[PDB]
Design a protein around this ligand. Structure first.
Ligand SMILES: [Zn+2]
Ligand SMILES: [Zn+2]
Lengths: 59, 273, 214, 280, 49, 49, 233, 116, 56
């Protein structure tokens, strides 16, 4: 009805306490470059920013 | 409205359209710049007929190949009583004869205006670069600086039916309805001269324009009415003489003096006061 | 040809307003000519083509007998309508000469668009005669007929003397009205002239006020 | 709120509280209701500050205006703001709302209420309303007096209609005549059946000379006398309408003693309503 | 798109004692560091200990 | 009304805003105690009785 | 309000590294004309990159926060309409807890992840203090049963007023208030309790929903001027 | 308008008129590259526009929990589930026409019955 | 009393149904905006008027 107008906490505490593969591929080796040639040598990446084809070998 | 024609709702529309300021921008969807190789044939399928119509019925040798096309809304030109013939002349009179214009008929499914600028006899080799740009300029000014009809500074007008008590022929007071136009924006001097309205009853919300057009005494009455409306808006009642004294003080110096330090405090009433 | 009719109608209304202004200033103007019908105006002040001849619209008015008794110093009045839109010094110069030549005490000049500054500065140059310039667009509607504008009556010198004496006032203690006031321009008031404003009051029915031109 | 889907325009979504305070507001309604109340609280704070400045400005602008012994309204400089306080010279504390009986009504009603005729038999005066109702019929000297009274009343109706274009008849006026008439009837115990002893000449002259004693301005010159006449224009219209010959004899049944009592009180009441010089 | 609403609580931040003291301490420490350098410079120039 | 019922029953009233508690439910409990359901009582003037 | 909290802020770098390792394409190679469907990723108002599969990414981020791998105070917003993914870690953001709603196909309709068993152990630890394993609020946060939500994140979730009526798929007492079900089957969160929107002062009013709103405001101010016992010392 | 961009330097192309053929050419103001135009339209101004009404539709629009669901029929697949939203244009001159997105075919239709 | 509450509940429901009808015509764009007002503004005025009258 009124879903219990009262806050029942005095005895509700007691109640709870009371209740308780086939070779169809190609495989190649991968070997690291010798470090003896990487010293005093820097390898960078070059990116041409353009929409056409740029090739310094021929262009 | 005129006392004789106050109840005629059909004439109210004539007055309403004759005072509302409308520009081409408010009655158009889009404007486009089209290029035609010659001013005798068209590339758009739609205007294939309009050119054949006007041209057959009919100078054009020196017309520029750049075309300005305006597409007007069918509904918009029907909300306000308008026809492409009148607006076409309106454009024709803004620039008297420096550009050629053709306009479709009302029966057409789409309402289109085609404009062409005619170059002078002298050839300007430098203007070809800005030829299209110039079209982009005039079209913008043709959307804004064109007054199809109405009084400037008049945004919109709405029709309302008010009740006023006028004496009856028998001798009693009876309430009859009349059509009254309410407007946003104020141009009292120009609107007061429009035919069809009652200039002896026009009222303005801003009492400043009343004073400039009708005089200080008219501004005095308008000022009181504005003050009275504010007081009476909430239903409170104040004796007339209290408001009259405030209004009289506000207009005693041959003008509307504010109640701030720039108004009554700039008089000559003693430094100590 | 609609535009032609629009100007004619506006000119006719402006002519009527000027006639009422002259009548209200205390000059002899019959009521019949004030209410001239539109068709009569188009018959006497227009031509075969239809465009009006504003030169012929100019007329002469003289003080009425009652005004002479109250103001025994007012002379004739001349009203001139300028045919050309742009008023120049040439037309202004002949207008003032036409006033000074025939002893016209007051001359009203009506222009269409504007008067050039080189001609405006010449307006106050023929005393004691006075020249008043009126724009036609401003004369289309008689502002004095508005319900908000009360009745203004100019007071004679004797009446002004009595007004101050009985109220024991000074010219600085009266309510002021500007010379540039639309009603003051309609009446041609001068500095020191007092006008009796008769207006309807909801507390006393009729209330009489006074304003001194400044 | 983060409980409705986008583009929800139902009343429950945009703040329609369907419940009452008795039933209680749901959490959505509670928040929307709280939002509305916050608007009122903010307005109260802002309105108080803004209005306070307005009141101070108004008071300082009109603080030096006073009514002088010549009835003119002037400021400290002596400049005239109004030539008579309130355009009528009365005090707001003594004004009451009264109905103007001449402006309203149809022409036929106006004729029936005020017109009195002694020659014809269309608007005749009943002989039982006064002790001289027999010899009154067929008199021309009194007929012209009645004609002038009716002519003035018709003129008053014309003037009133031109002032109040809306036809409103209830306006604030100084003296409440209706109460004075009631007091006279109740004080003297008017018979209401026996014919009165009043005469047409006495009534018309009694009202006419009463209007002369209603003095707001007492100058002895034309300008002040004209101003005095104008100041009591509206009140005289009310006075004439209420104290009409037909209305007094037919509607009020007033006696000569009662009529004299009414006239004296109206003069006394009007003089008490005049604004007092020196009032700020 | 609609203009950003200035009252949106999601665009507002609350500075508690933590952040409030952080900026205050940062300003004061900056002054302390400046004073330390001035003493170092003064000692070198004026030849003090 | 809730407080009156709580005192008569020796309980702590639950007045949290958004719950299933209704005024009618309180009234029913109050009537079970022999009191007017709406909390009205017959009183006597202290001056005259 | 009673259940509102303010974040203290943490380092955003670990999240940035985590995003990069899970496919957040860097902004140095983002070509808009070759991928006009990627969702922009923002961290503390910093555009770090774009992602091709925002739905999968958000699922991973949400799970990590709920289990306790990312700090709960971190706010994640996915603007599907604008194709933006905003992550906020700065301090000063006001947030509050809410229940988590999931499908739970066992019952066939969405329901709260918190069950009666969780509540049973919650109260057991509450009342044992006055020995089962400890179970506190932090346990709920680490179990993904509750979640901190800030104002910005509320713009992309749907919350239920109460689990009694809105969560279950869907005579009436004439005295009960008219409650709207809203007939929504996509709830993502559920309010802990609607009464928690009030503050400390407004939580003392009994039946504040039966009062005119301005009166509640007056009580809040007046409740702070009432004589009582401010402290026991 | 279909803006065209240069091919050699990616700069913005502009329209130019050649009298040798009375045709339309697009030329670059910086690198002197020409290209024949495909359409005679070069400028388009839209006072009243319907572009952006359905902005924000994505392949996973149905995953949004806030978006409301409806039972309207999709007139391309005969389905009942769908999510609807109003126009995204913020101008205070647009109608309240709804836009429905089907969760089975991603087809966008409208409830408009005036113009459609 | 009970009968008054039943009438009140129905009265509010009728107003809501009226609001439902207008909200359906606007979605179909079959509603013409009142002169001097926008479609959205006209719709809001109709909704507010119905709800205000429902309370009265
Ligand atoms: Zn290029
Ligand atoms: Zn479909």
């Amino acid at each position: 009805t009124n879903a219990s107008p009262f806050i029942k906490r005095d005895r509700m505490r007691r109640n709870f306490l009371r209740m308780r593969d086939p070779n169809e591929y190609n495989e190649f080796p991968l070997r690291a470059i010798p470090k003896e040639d990487l010293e005093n040598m820097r390898t960078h990446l070059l990116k041409f920013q353009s929409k056409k084809k740029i090739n310094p070998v021929t262009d | 409205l005129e006392p004789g024609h106050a109840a005629d709702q059909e004439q109210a529309k004539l007055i309403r359209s004759a005072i509302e300021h409308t520009t081409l921008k408010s009655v158009t969807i889009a404007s486009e710049i089209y290029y035609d190789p010659d001013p005798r044939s068209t590339v758009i399928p739609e205007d294939e007929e309009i050119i054949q119509l006007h041209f057959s019925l009919l100078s054009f040798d020196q017309q520029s190949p750049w075309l300005l096309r305006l597409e007007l809304d069918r509904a918009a030109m029907n909300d306000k009583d308008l026809t492409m013939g009148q607006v076409g002349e309106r454009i024709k009179q803004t620039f008297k004869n420096d550009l050629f214009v053709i306009w479709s008929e009302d029966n057409d499914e789409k309402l289109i205006i085609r404009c062409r600028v005619v170059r002078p006899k002298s050839l300007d080799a430098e203007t070809e670069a800005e030829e299209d740009h110039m079209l982009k300029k005039i079209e913008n000014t043709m959307l804004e600086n064109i007054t199809l009809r109405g009084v400037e500074n008049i945004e919109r007008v709405v029709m309302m039916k008010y009740d006023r008590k006028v004496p009856s022929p028998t001798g009693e007071y009876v309430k009859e309805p009349e059509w009254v136009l309410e407007t946003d924006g104020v141009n009292l001097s120009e609107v007061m001269t429009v035919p069809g309205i009652d200039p002896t009853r026009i009222y303005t919300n801003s009492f400043i324009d009343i004073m400039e057009v009708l005089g200080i005494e008219a501004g005095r009455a308008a000022l009181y009415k504005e003050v009275y409306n504010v007081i009476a808006s909430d239903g409170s009642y104040v004796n007339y003489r209290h408001m009259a004294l405030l209004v009289d003080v506000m207009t005693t110096q041959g003008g509307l003096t504010s109640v701030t330090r720039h108004g009554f405090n700039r008089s000559n009433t003693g430094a100590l006061m | 040809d609609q535009e032609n009719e629009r100007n004619i109608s506006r000119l006719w209304r402006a002519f009527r307003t000027v006639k009422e202004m002259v009548k209200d200033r205390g000059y002899f103007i019959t009521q019949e000519e004030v209410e001239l019908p539109l068709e009569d105006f188009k018959a006497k002040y227009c031509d075969s083509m239809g465009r009006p001849q504003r030169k012929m619209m100019s007329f002469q008015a003289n003080p009425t007998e009652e005004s002479i008794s109250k103001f025994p110093d007012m002379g004739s009045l001349w009203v001139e309508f300028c045919d050309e839109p742009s008023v120049g010094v040439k037309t202004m110069k002949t207008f003032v000469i036409h006033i000074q030549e025939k002893n016209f005490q007051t001359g009203i000049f009506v222009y269409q668009n504007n008067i050039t500054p080189s001609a405006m500065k010449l307006v106050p140059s023929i005393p004691p005669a006075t020249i008043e310039t009126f724009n036609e667009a401003a004369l289309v509607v008689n502002i004095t007929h508005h319900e908000l504008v009360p009745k203004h009556i100019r007071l004679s010198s004797d009446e002004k003397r009595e007004l101050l004496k009985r109220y024991r006032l000074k010219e600085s203690q009266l309510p002021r009205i500007q010379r540039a006031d639309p009603v003051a321009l309609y009446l041609g008031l001068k500095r020191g002239e007092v006008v009796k404003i008769i207006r309807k009051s909801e507390t006393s029915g009729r209330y009489a006020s006074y304003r001194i031109c400044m | 709120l983060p409980h409705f889907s986008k583009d929800d325009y139902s009343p429950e979504s945009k703040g329609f509280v369907e419940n009452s305070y008795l039933r209680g507001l749901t959490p959505q309604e509670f928040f929307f209701h709280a939002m509305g109340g916050r608007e009122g609280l903010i307005d109260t704070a802002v309105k108080t500050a803004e209005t306070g400045y307005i009141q101070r400005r108004l008071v300082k602008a009109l603080e030096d205006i006073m009514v002088h012994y010549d009835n003119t309204t002037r400021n400290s400089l002596g400049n005239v703001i109004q030539f008579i306080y309130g355009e009528d010279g009365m005090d707001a504390a003594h004004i009451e709302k009264q109905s103007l009986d001449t402006i309203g009504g149809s022409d036929a009603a106006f004729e029936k209420r005020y017109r009195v005729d002694l020659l014809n038999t269309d608007h005749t005066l009943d002989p039982s309303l006064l002790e001289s109702g027999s010899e009154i019929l067929g008199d021309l000297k009194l007929q012209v007096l009645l004609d002038e009274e009716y002519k003035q009343l018709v003129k008053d109706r014309k003037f009133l209609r031109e002032v109040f274009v809306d036809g409103e008849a209830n306006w604030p006026l100084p003296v409440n005549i209706r109460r004075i008439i009631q007091n006279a009837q109740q004080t003297f115990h008017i018979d209401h059946t026996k014919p009165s002893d009043l005469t047409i000449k006495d009534i018309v002259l009694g009202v006419k000379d009463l209007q002369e004693n209603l003095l707001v301005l007492r100058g002895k010159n034309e300008i002040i006398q004209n101003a005095q006449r104008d100041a009591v224009t509206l009140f005289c219209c009310l006075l004439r309408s209420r104290l009409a010959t037909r209305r007094v004899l037919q509607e009020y049944r007033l006696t000569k003693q009662a009529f004299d009592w009414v006239l004296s009180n109206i003069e006394a009441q009007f003089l008490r309503s005049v604004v007092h010089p020196g009032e700020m | 798109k609609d203009q950003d609403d200035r009252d949106h609580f999601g665009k507002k931040r609350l500075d508690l004692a933590g952040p409030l003291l952080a900026q205050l301490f940062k300003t004061l420490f900056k002054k302390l560091t400046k004073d330390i350098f001035r003493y170092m410079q003064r000692t070198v120039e004026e030849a003090h200990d | 009304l809730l407080s009156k019922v709580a005192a008569l029953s020796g309980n702590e009233g639950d007045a949290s805003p958004f719950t299933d508690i209704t005024v009618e439910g309180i009234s029913k409990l109050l009537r079970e105690h022999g009191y007017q359901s709406r909390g009205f009582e017959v009183m006597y003037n202290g001056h005259t009785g | 309000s009673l259940m509102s909290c303010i974040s203290v802020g943490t380092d955003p770098m670990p999240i940035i590294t985590f995003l990069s390792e899970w496919g957040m394409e860097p902004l140095e190679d983002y070509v808009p004309h070759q991928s006009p469907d990627a969702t922009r990723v923002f961290v503390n108002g910093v555009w770090h990159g774009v992602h091709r599969n925002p739905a999968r990414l958000m699922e991973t981020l949400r799970t990590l926060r709920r289990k306790g791998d990312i700090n709960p105070e971190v706010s994640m917003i996915r603007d599907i309409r604008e194709k933006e993914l905003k992550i906020f870690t700065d301090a000063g953001r006001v947030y509050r807890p809410l229940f988590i709603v999931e499908d739970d196909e066992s019952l066939g309709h969405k329901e709260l992840k918190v069950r009666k068993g969780h509540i049973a152990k919650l109260m057991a630890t509450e009342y044992q203090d006055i020995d089962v394993e400890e179970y506190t609020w932090s346990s709920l946060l680490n179990e993904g049963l509750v979640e901190y939500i800030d104002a910005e994140e509320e713009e992309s979730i749907l919350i239920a007023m109460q689990p009694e009526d809105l969560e279950p798929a869907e005579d009436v007492d004439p005295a009960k208030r008219i409650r709207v079900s809203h007939h929504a089957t996509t709830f993502t969160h559920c309010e802990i309790h609607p009464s928690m929107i009030l503050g400390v002062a407004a939580s003392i009013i009994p039946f504040p929903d039966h009062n005119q709103s301005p009166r509640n405001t007056y009580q809040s101010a007046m409740g702070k001027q009432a004589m009582g016992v401010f402290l026991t010392n | 308008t279909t803006f065209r961009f240069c091919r050699d330097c990616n700069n913005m192309l502009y329209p130019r008129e050649d009298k040798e053929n009375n045709r339309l050419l697009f030329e670059c103001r910086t690198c002197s590259y020409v290209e024949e135009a495909g359409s005679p339209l070069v400028y388009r101004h839209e006072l009243i526009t319907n572009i952006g009404e359905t902005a924000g539709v994505v392949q996973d629009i149905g995953s949004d929990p806030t978006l409301p669901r409806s039972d309207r029929e999709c007139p391309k697949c005969h389905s009942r589930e769908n999510v609807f939203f109003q126009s995204q244009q913020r101008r205070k001159d647009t109608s309240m026409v709804l836009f429905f997105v089907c969760l089975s075919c991603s087809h966008i239709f409208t409830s408009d019955q005036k113009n459609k | 009393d009970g009968p008054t509450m039943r009438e009140i509940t129905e009265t509010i429901a009728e107003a809501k149904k009226k609001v439902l009808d207008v909200t359906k015509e606007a979605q179909a764009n079959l509603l013409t905006a009142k002169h001097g007002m926008t479609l959205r503004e006209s719709f809001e005025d109709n909704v507010v008027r119905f709800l205000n009258e429902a309370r009265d």
